[PDB]
Structures are given as structure tokens and as C-alpha cells.
Amino acid sequence: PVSRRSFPKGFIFGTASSSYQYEGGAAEGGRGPSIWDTFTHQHPEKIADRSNGDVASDSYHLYKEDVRLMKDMGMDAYRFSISWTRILPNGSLRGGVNKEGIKYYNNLINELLSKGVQPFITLFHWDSPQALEDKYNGFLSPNIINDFKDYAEICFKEFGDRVKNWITFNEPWTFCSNGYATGLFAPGRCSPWEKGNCSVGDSGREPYTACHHQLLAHAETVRLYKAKYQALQKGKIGITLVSHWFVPFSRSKSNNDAAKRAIDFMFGWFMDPLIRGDYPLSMRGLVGNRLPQFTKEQSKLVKGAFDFIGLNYYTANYADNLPPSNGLNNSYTTDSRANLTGVRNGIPIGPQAASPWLYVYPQGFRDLLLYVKENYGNPTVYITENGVDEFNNKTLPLQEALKDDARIEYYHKHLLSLLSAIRDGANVKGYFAWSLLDNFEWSNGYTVRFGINFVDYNDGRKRYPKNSAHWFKKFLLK
Ligand SMILES: *[C@H]1O[C@H](CO)[C@@H](O)[C@H](O)[C@H]1F
Ligand SMILES: [Zn+2]
């Protein structure tokens, strides 16, 4: 049976977390508010259970238990994020550096290393400073670049002596599409007719502006890291990107081209600038002047601006051709001219998890990795997120809640799929499971549980290993 020993020597296995989802202590230790603090408190109706990340999984206090839990399993590495507003409470240098915030992450990093766990740090996992949102609309302004760069530099200076793996942005696709196209995530911006029924926004322009600025802030940060830090600290810097696998709705060329446009808009949006120096052709053609243009100098900067790419995979969609709109309802969601579904002829592409967007389709994992291999020059890849969820069920006894056989099944099949892709030449160096603990699942709150370990929110955030924790322990032997 598949184990760590099936994988190449030195292959890294870990779990993944994020600051807002895990930490809590939201107004503690000098932490400033982020856009997710604001979104959750000011728009509780946008969250399934009207909840927030004030306490979350309380990892701000309980991080030592987290490290113990992952060490028990035999994890090599931990993917976590730093809260921007823990370090810079109002987003900028001039607003002051929070020493207490630096202390917490030093304590976390030191605890991890004392137990032989390598820290992988995401700089931006969506908890953008509210003060910069108020000041200049955050990522909608080119002002965000320098503020992010200043924030990143503090992190390199304070932590880079021990941290050798950096990720700038987590899934800019999700941040921009849900935050500015549908308006379902913070900062909750969209066109009036879009899903979020937002008071402010433009779903056909703002997603592209926000993500253009992220690509620029990323490339600037990579450059800065390589120029001032990489020589003496000898770490690696990358970016985390998400993609579904897209199955053509039918075998027609039209639906095959729709599947190609689907991946271009979700994934190529960031990959093409990183590999080829410009946005995908389909994006430039279809979006036109609503898509920002890189200057020759900016194109030079973004191209090759990485040591690795973090790759996230969860599910697959069917892609069906959409006729032009062709009109006054322009939105990133429809701009691809590809209609995305998880069901065809009343049959779901795979078994549906607790998240309605999550269909279990392990075959697409291999398919995506081989697509990246053949179409992007087979770059160094870490799987930075892969996982599945069950419903939070208050009626179930604890012992039945810990029996997550569906999670075991999910990981077994995906790791096999990953292994076959590696054996067929995919340049994959590591794998991170989402998630170590149950946590705040954004617009779903605490209604769904992604964790390998259970968190009892009603009993002081006590952690209990699920059956999958024991499974990973066996898997990770040696
Ligand atoms: C990756 O996906 C998971 C599951 O939806 C989120 O909880 C993480 O924050 C995201 F980075
Ligand atoms: Zn506590």
C-alpha cells in the first residue's frame, strides 16, 4: 500500500493553515483589524452561521498543541500564514511595527523547529489591512505594492534567518473573484446584479485591477528577496495558485475550447505572466481594456519571478461553451465564455463533499499536474493545499464525529494520483494537506470541518485527532 516510502527521497509532507482561520486573538497583542474582521462583523449575513474569526481555533494561544499534533503524525513541514496586521497594525511602516506580533511568530517558528518541522510561510492569506482599505481601497490601488513590500521585508528581516520557504500570495484567484467579482468574500465588492448584491464595486474591472496589483506586489517582493536576502538566508520564494481540472462538457471541439478558456482564466491568469511575461491570449482578447496591461519593464519583472509554484487542487468542473453576453453585465465570472458545472445529465462529476463546490475527483489531480508539466516548462511545484470537508454536526457524539473515513478515502486516492503524476515526470517536491485543524471556513464559517484534527469550539477549542490523523501517522512512517 502507498506510503511516504513510495515517494521520492526528500519529499516533503505537511499540513496547511492560515492566520485568520486559525489564530483568534483578533484584537489581542496589538493586532489591527483586517478586511475579514470588518466583513464578518459588518456583514454577518454573508457568513453561513453569522460567525467570525475573533477566536477561531485559538491557535494564538494553542499553537504549541498544534505543533505537538503535527509532530505526532510525523509531518515534515507546516504551511502557515502571517497576519499582516499583527506585524503592521495599520498596514504601513509609518503606522508602526508591532513587536508583540513579531514575538508570536518567532515563538511559533521556534516551536516548530525545536520539533524538526520546517516552516513554510505565506505572507498574504487574504487578511488585508482594513486601514489600507479605508485609506485607498487596498489592492485596488498601486499604493498596496510598497506597503506589501515593506511588510514582506520586516518578515525577511525578523524571520528569514530560520524561514527558508516563502509564499507571497495565497490563491489570488479566490481573493479577486470572490472579493471583487461575486463579492461573497471580503472586501465584499461587486456589481449590483452580482451574487453579493454589493453596495460598491465593478465585477468587470475590479477583479483584474486587484490581481494585477498582486502580481506586481509579488514580482517586486521576489526581486527584493533575491536582491537583499537570498544570498545570506538561502531560502526560496514562490506563490500559491489554485486550479480545478476542467472536463469538456461534451467531446465537441467547442467544449474542449471552453475547458481551455476555463483554465486560462482561473490559472493562466497568473501562470502565463509568470512563465511567458503576459496574460493569456484568451484573456487579452475577451476582456480587452478591462484587463490591465504590463509595461515592457513590468513584463520583464513578473516573468520568471519564482523559485517554485505552490499548487492547490480540490475538484473538477465540467466546462460548457457560453455564447457572448454581450452587453452591460460584464463580470469576471462570465468573461471566460465558459459555463462551469459539477453536474452533467443529473450525474455529479464526483461525490459532493460538505462544501457544495467540492466534488471528489482524484483523476483531475494527475491531469492538472501533467498539464502544468507539458504547458509551463514543468516548474518546481509544491502541492500547497489539498483536502476535503464534512459538515459540522452538533447532534453527533464526539466519537462518531472523529470517524472521517471519507477524508481517509480522499487522501488515499489523491496521493496515489499525485504519485502516478510524479512517476510520469511531474516536478513536484512536496505536499501539504488542508487542513491540520478544523477552522473558520470563510463564508461558510464553522458549518464545515476541513481538519485532520477536530476542534471542539464549545469546549475551549480542545483538539481531538480524527481517524485520518492515525492514517497519516501510518502513511508517514519512515
Ligand atoms: C484553500 O482552500 C481552503 C478550503 O476552502 C481554505 O479554507 C483556505 O483558506 C484556502 F487557502
Ligand atoms: Zn486561548
UniProtKB/Swiss-Prot annotation:
Q: Which InterPro entries match?
A: Glyco_hydro_1, Glyco_hydro_1_N_CS, Glycoside_hydrolase_SF
Q: Which Gene Ontology MF annotations are present?
A: beta-D-fucosidase activity; beta-galactosidase activity; beta-gentiobiose beta-glucosidase activity; beta-L-arabinosidase activity; glucan exo-1,3-beta-glucosidase activity
Q: Which UniProt keywords apply?
A: Disulfide bond, Glycoprotein, Glycosidase, Hydrolase, Secreted, Signal
Q: Which residue positions carry a glycan here?
A: 90, 197, 329, 339, 393
Q: Which GO terms describe its cellular component?
A: extracellular region
Q: What functional role does this protein have? A: Hydrolyzes p-nitrophenyl beta-D-glucoside, p-nitrophenyl beta-D-galactoside, p-nitrophenyl beta-D-xyloside, p-nitrophenyl beta-D-fucoside, p-nitrophenyl beta-L-arabinoside, cello-oligosaccharides and laminaribiose.
Give the enzyme's EC designation: 3.2.1.21
Q: Where does it localize?
A: Secreted
Give disulfide pairs as residue numbers. Answer: 176-211, 190-198
Reactions listed under catalytic activity = Hydrolysis of terminal, non-reducing beta-D-glucosyl residues with release of beta-D-glucose
Entry's Gene Ontology BP terms: carbohydrate metabolic process
Source domain of life is: Eukaryota
Q: Which residues form the active site?
A: 171, 385
SUPFAM superfamilies, per this entry?
Answer: (Trans)glycosidases
- Positions annotated to bind a beta-D-glucoside: 21, 125, 170-171, 314, 385, 434, 441-442, 450
Q: What is this protein called?
A: Beta-glucosidase 12
Q: Which family is it part of?
A: Belongs to the glycosyl hydrolase 1 family.
